[PDB]
């Protein structure tokens, strides 16, 4: 906790904003010499996990392979959202109506792996999750995104949750580390801190 | 009539330009061209290869970072300010260049880090500009970012702008299109709309 180690983490802009922010906050107190490079999700993360060029990979666990140690962070529900200004979004929407509307969707980098949800007519593609609410605001487009993201934006961008009529989908966000680092003291320390925070979040 | 087209435009730009500028484009064309669609592409590898193959319609970037092989147009002037957290104690007052070089710094790296931003101890590197205010809030780290970005987060994330002490630095955001598309009617239509919106942003 008195180190000057630089950790490298691969994660979504969503996970950076809604979760890792807690880590940076806490450690700015508990370990003020520890630094971070947050890397964008784009290429197979495995290549970097096998070589040990990254300390951590945060991803929903369905997208990880079984060749590195991983740990459950928390459950994330996927909801369908729209702009309060949208008329059709007033009332209940039929799965048929969903597939009849214009969609905003996130494509991470070169789109190696697919969005947990994805056919819909996508009229807006963006490099992450976080730009989706602002670029959706004021149009008749809908999107499907983490429920923790909609809450982060509650006081900033009002969003109408319309998923109530469609399938209930939830994934479990998780953290993975290289097996070559399973006994690194820095790695176990950061690991345990991340899991602590994720449990706090599971309570919410 | 391109206002009734179903063309999909591909644009390369920063999360900053997506959030403070292209949003206006998407907003306006939602009523003026309800079928035109967009794929916003992240800044990563040399955009010159996508421009020389006409694989995208537009690249939005500060003009110092563009080459002279493709036609481009001035969008607007963007000031670069130094920001910190109101809760930072040593940010109450003025910050010397030496003092600045003695503090922790949050910075943006785009993709593989092929291009530098416009001797600092960078304690946090993040893949764009937009995550910088949130990840900075509540720490003693500072950053340098477009002043239009600070104004966007003014009501959500309070930030302290440090201005008087360090140098005044501003660049010019611009738009570029492939030379092979200089005549494309669709390209000119979107291009000119983009220019109109930039002028309203002084
Ligand atoms: C290697 O390329 C990829 C890996 C993982 C993803 C998934 C894709 C995805 O749906 C996703 C998510 O819903 C939440 C999250 O925190 C991170 C996510 O990333 C996309 C990619 O393009
Ligand atoms: C998956 O992790 C991330 C993905 C994208 C970002 C932002 C996300 C984003 O929207 C973006 C963009 O439009 C242009 C660009 O050049 C870089 C961008 O990166 C931050 C992340 O942490
Ligand atoms: C293809 O590689 C790159 C191209 C341009 C950049 C610049 C880097 C940069 O400083 C910059 C900016 O100040 C404003 C903006 O809107 C977009 C910017 O992107 C970074 C890259 O990694």
């Amino acid at each position: 906790a008195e180190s000057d180690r630089r950790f490298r983490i691969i994660l979504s802009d969503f996970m950076a904003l809604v979760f890792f922010d807690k880590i940076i906050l806490r450690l700015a107190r508990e370990a003020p010499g520890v630094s971070f490079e947050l890397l964008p999700l784009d290429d197979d993360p495995e290549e970097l996990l096998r070589r040990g060029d990254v300390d951590f990979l945060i991803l929903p666990d369905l997208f990880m392979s079984g060749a590195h140690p991983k740990a459950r962070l928390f459950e994330e529900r996927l909801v369908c959202v729209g702009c309060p200004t949208n008329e059709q979004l007033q009332g209940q929407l039929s799965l048929e109506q969903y597939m009849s509307m214009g969609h905003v969707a996130a494509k991470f980098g070169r789109g190696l792996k697919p969005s947990v949800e994805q056919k819909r007519r996508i009229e807006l593609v963006v490099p992450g999750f976080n730009l989706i609410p602002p670029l959706l605001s004021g149009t008749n487009r809908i999107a499907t995104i983490p429920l923790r993201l909609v809450k982060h934006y509650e006081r900033t961008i009002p969003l109408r949750i319309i998923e109530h009529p469609l399938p209930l989908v939830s994934f479990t966000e998780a953290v993975q580390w290289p097996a070559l680092h399973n006994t690194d003291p820095g790695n176990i320390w950061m690991r345990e801190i991340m899991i602590q925070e994720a449990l706090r979040m599971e309570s919410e």
Side-chain angles (χ1 to χ4, degrees), chain A residues 24-41 44-46 48-49 52-94 97-118 120-126:
Chain A
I24 282 147
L25 265 152
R26 175 170 162 180
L27 261 52
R29 209 194 267 180
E30 265 161 67
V34 174
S35 83
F36 309 89
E37 160 165 7
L38 301 183
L39 294 137
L41 249 180
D44 199 7
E46 182 82 15
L48 295 174
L49 283 177
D53 308 307
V54 175
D55 316 65
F56 287 104
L57 167 70
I58 293 153
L59 249 54
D61 55 356
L62 62 80
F63 296 118
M64 311 158 152
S65 78
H68 305 274
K70 13 149 338 272
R72 185 182 295 276
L73 286 168
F74 54 77
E75 198 184 324
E76 189 52 67
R77 178 144 137 65
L78 260 191
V79 302
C80 165
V81 288
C83 194
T85 76
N86 192 342
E87 326 270 5
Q88 293 177 335
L89 295 174
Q90 302 229 337
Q92 269 56 57
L93 173 141
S94 81
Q97 291 173 298
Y98 176 91
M99 293 281 184
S100 100
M101 274 174 103
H103 289 250
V104 193
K107 172 195 181 186
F108 280 124
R110 39 216 107 178
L112 290 190
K113 304 311 164 185
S115 314
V116 175
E117 80 265 357
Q118 69 166 139
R120 299 168 298 163
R121 164 171 94 262
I122 296 142
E123 324 186 313
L124 186 44
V125 178
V126 292

Side-chain angles (χ1 to χ4, degrees), chain A residues 178-190:
Chain A
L180 316 88
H181 296 28
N182 192 31
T183 55
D184 195 10
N187 192 284
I188 322 177
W189 171 70
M190 179 139 268

